[PDB]
Amino acid sequence: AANDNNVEWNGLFHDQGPLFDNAPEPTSTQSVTLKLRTFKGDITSANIKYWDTADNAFHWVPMVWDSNDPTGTFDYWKGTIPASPSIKYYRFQINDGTSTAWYNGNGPSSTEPNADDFYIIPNFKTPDWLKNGVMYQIFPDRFYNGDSSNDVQTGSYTYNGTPTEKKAWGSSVYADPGYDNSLVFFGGDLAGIDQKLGYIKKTLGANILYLNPIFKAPTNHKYDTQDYMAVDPAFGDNSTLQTLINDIHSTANGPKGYLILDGVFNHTGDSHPWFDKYNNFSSQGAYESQSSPWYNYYTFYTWPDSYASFLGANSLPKLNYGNSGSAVRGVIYNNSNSVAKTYLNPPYSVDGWRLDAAQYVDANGNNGSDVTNHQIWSEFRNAVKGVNSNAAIIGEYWGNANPWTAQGNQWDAATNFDGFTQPVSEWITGKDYQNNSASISTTQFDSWLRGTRANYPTNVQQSMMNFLSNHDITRFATRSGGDLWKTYLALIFQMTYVGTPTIYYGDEYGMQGGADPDNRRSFDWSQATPSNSAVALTQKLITIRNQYPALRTGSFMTLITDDTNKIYSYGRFDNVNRIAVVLNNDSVSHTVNVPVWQLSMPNGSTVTDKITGHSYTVQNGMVTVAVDGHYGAVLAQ
């Protein structure tokens, strides 16, 4: 508020939203103009300090005063980083006389940071439909049996000496004595998914479908691939897939949709002809003969029983990617008829790939997270984007996936376990996603969220797969002990946060479930109606996100972190809208004075809480709103 040898952190702000960055996804020829907010008349000088990888050196760009915001409460300073194809990282040095502060991806700091700088990755682009959409994940066998004739029946077939077992819809997922949990089937198929597209694209509003494995495999999950080129008969055939894809892409049954498939490229099942451990094919697999034409596709320590596999599971023999140009890299992604390209090109034209166990992909049986792994995912990107620049690549990773995204040469994003699923779980349910006791306060939540966002480039952040739960962790509804209000709170946050809101089938109505396989229960369609509280909220929240671009690609600013009342408030805003989200994580209601002046909401102007429908007036930079415990409001204008 004045030149007093003091930089006020509360008035400072910057991120790569439209108000502060004119080129979030620049090419080699586009310069980047940045704006830094501060309280009006608070500083004396500011400078942009950026590291240029082309020059392995720091560069300085003094900033100049640009303007004030409509409310005359803040100043905006600007500076431009020149154009070039090189990746750069920047931070701000902010001075007010004898007071100096720094600011980067992690926010304000008294001392200069050495990490979490903002990213500038020329020519790096993630599909905008991914940044702006809402995803719905489906575990095929448990969503909807659209065709009873292709159902796996009890004893239909055997796998490793165990018969398959069919279950009545709604029954327990656990295998009865004599059967295996991996061979329990309910009948869910592609025809069913197709027949329920209205529910997904209209009742809910989700425009993106992500499916767990659908290719030929003996198990329930099908991560033990037997044939990447054929849809498993239990789910239909390749034509059944084409029809589904066309109906998903169609706008005659709702909004234009996108299809993302699960790509299991680190390994195959042990029954794949390349391996053929049980001799299910006349051809000779690697397990059968060292003269097998596919022998080299795998790594044997002691042929044929000891070989590299996924975490020791013999049913999952690991693929050897060898050096560039290898036959394996060829069948998986380089060949026009490879698994990756086949489904991306017509007559399929799917829209993306979810990369299973992506961190392990490697050569000679090694375990990835190395130079070879990253080289492979680099060529993978080239192969994919070369066929469809708008095809999504989302790798599976439970920690900081910066290594596979920050270079702009590998994935578009990743499964946001670390930056979304875990923090949300611990804040709202007091448990980690494994249902183990782990709780965090509101201030910790906000700190966790910011720190994890800072791990990634802005476009990557906006494309992260943010799910409350999935096929590998306990259901949110179980972690919350059945308290549906906790699901309410989780949904409101999910639909208003940075990254692709991802709904694991059932979560929208509060489905429960423990650890795999109980987290893959059949879907109860009588609960699949807005008559169900959670469902109605979901539809409403999705409608809201689609209505406000600021919610998908806008800036994110922390507004309130109250650990006594358990209130968390943040804003999402761009050049058109300003939205203050207010969440009540307490078990009682609270009346909150939201400081919407921080988002520059003019006084006297009104805002509407899209959740309830009630309207409010901005008084003295504030907006007073009463919020129920474990619930929230979305004040937009």
Structure-token pair, residue 10: 């509360």
**Does 472 show up as a binding residue in the annotation?**
yes
* Distance of closest approach, residue 150 Cβ to Ca ion, in angstroms: 5
Q: Which is nearer to Ca ion, 293 or 347 (CB)?
A: 293
Q: Which is nearer to Ca ion, 85 or 97 (CB)?
A: 97
Q: Which is nearer to Ca ion, 53 or 296 (CB)?
A: 296
Q: Which is nearer to Ca ion, 151 or 237 (CB)?
A: 151
The answer to whether residue 356 is catalytic is yes
**Does 354 show up as a binding residue in the annotation?**
yes
* Distance of closest approach, residue 589 Cβ to Ca ion, in angstroms: 38
**Does 151 show up as a binding residue in the annotation?**
yes
Q: Which residues lie closer than 8 Å to 535 by C-beta, 6 or more apart?
A: 203, 204, 508, 509, 527, 528, 529
Q: Which residues lie closer than 8 Å to 371 by C-beta, 6 or more apart?
A: none
Cite the DSSP H helix spans in 177-313.
Answer: 190-195, 197-198, 238-249
Q: Which is nearer to Ca ion, 98 or 591 (CB)?
A: 98
User: Cα separations (Å) of 231 from 238, 241, 445, 542?
Assistant: 6, 7, 42, 31
Cite the DSSP H helix spans in 525-565.
Answer: 533-547, 549-553
Q: Nearest to residue 39, comparing CAs of 4, 15, 63?
A: 4
CA 149 to chain CA mean position, Å: 35
Structure-token pair, residue 136: 């719905």
* Distance of closest approach, residue 237 Cβ to Ca ion, in angstroms: 12
Q: Which residues lie closer than 8 Å to 501 by C-beta, 6 or more apart?
A: 134, 135, 466, 494, 495, 542, 545
* Distance of closest approach, residue 505 Cβ to Ca ion, in angstroms: 16
Structure-token pair, residue 621: 């930079």
* Distance of closest approach, residue 344 Cβ to Ca ion, in angstroms: 27
Q: Of 396, 426, 432, 446, which is the active-site residue?
A: 396
**Does 187 show up as a binding residue in the annotation?**
yes
**Does 276 show up as a binding residue in the annotation?**
yes
With H, G, I as helix, E, B as strand and everything else as coil, classify residue 164: coil
Q: Which is nearer to Ca ion, 145 or 225 (CB)?
A: 145
Cite the DSSP H helix spans in 411-565.
Answer: 422-428, 442-453, 458-461, 476-479, 484-494, 533-547, 549-553
Q: What does the alpha-carbon distance between residue 199 and residue 513 come to, in Å, rounded to a whole number?
A: 22
* Distance of closest approach, residue 231 Cβ to Ca ion, in angstroms: 12
Q: Nearest to residue 217, comparing CAs of 282, 158, 164, 272?
A: 272
**Does 323 show up as a binding residue in the annotation?**
no
- CB count within 10 Å of CB 620 equals 9
Q: Which is nearer to Ca ion, 279 or 443 (CB)?
A: 279
Q: Of 356, 412, 418, 609, which is the active-site residue?
A: 356
469-484 b/e (C-beta count within 10 Å ≥ 16 → b): bbbbbbbbbbbbeebb
Structure-token pair, residue 102: 């720094």
**Does 364 show up as a binding residue in the annotation?**
no
* Distance of closest approach, residue 5 Cβ to Ca ion, in angstroms: 7
**Does 470 show up as a binding residue in the annotation?**
no
141 φ, ψ (degrees, to nearest 5)? -65, -15
**Does 520 show up as a binding residue in the annotation?**
yes
| Residues in touch with Ca ion (CB under 5 A) | 4, 6, 42, 96, 145, 147, 150-151, 187, 189, 276, 279, 281
Catalytic residues: 356, 396
Could you tell me which residues are annotated as the binding site for Ca(2+)?
A: 2, 4, 6, 42, 96, 145, 147, 150-151, 187, 189, 276, 280-281, 283, 288
Binding-site annotation, residues = 2, 4, 6, 42, 96, 145, 147, 150-151, 187, 189, 267, 276, 280-281, 283, 288, 354, 471-472, 516, 520
Q: Residues within the annotated binding site for substrate?
A: 267, 354, 471-472, 516, 520
